[PDB]
Design a protein around this nucleic acid. Structure first.
Ligand SMILES: [Zn+2]
Length: 56
RNA sequence: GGGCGAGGGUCUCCUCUGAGUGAUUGACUACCCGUCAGCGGGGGUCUUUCAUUUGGGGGCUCGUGCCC
């Protein structure tokens, strides 16, 4: 058996242009489902994150 | 079979392009300003040329010279 697949991830080859992006991806980490402005791998401000809920 | 030196593929880490802006130019010209009312200057737009932007490291693997 050989599976007929190779689990390729790409995002490399010689250039770093829009070649691995779409309007549903992140310019910073190349994930699909969010944009760089909300990247789960990038810092936030002005002095940390900005939540909208709390508990007591 | 292993090490050392170089490179390719692949993954990984540093990961942020989401169809911008300015100047040159022929024509047309929303709009504004001055006109002997003929036009003239600024402004808008399509064409146009130029500038602004394209890297690196590490693992694994393939490969090769030398060494063991
Ligand atoms: Zn992201």
């Amino acid at each position: 058996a050989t599976v007929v697949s190779g689990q390729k991830q790409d995002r490399q080859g010689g250039e770093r242009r829009r070649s691995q992006l779409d309007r549903d991806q992140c310019a910073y980490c190349k994930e699909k489902g969010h944009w760089a402005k909300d990247c789960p791998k990038k810092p936030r401000g002005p002095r940390g994150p900005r939540p909208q809920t709390s508990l007591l």
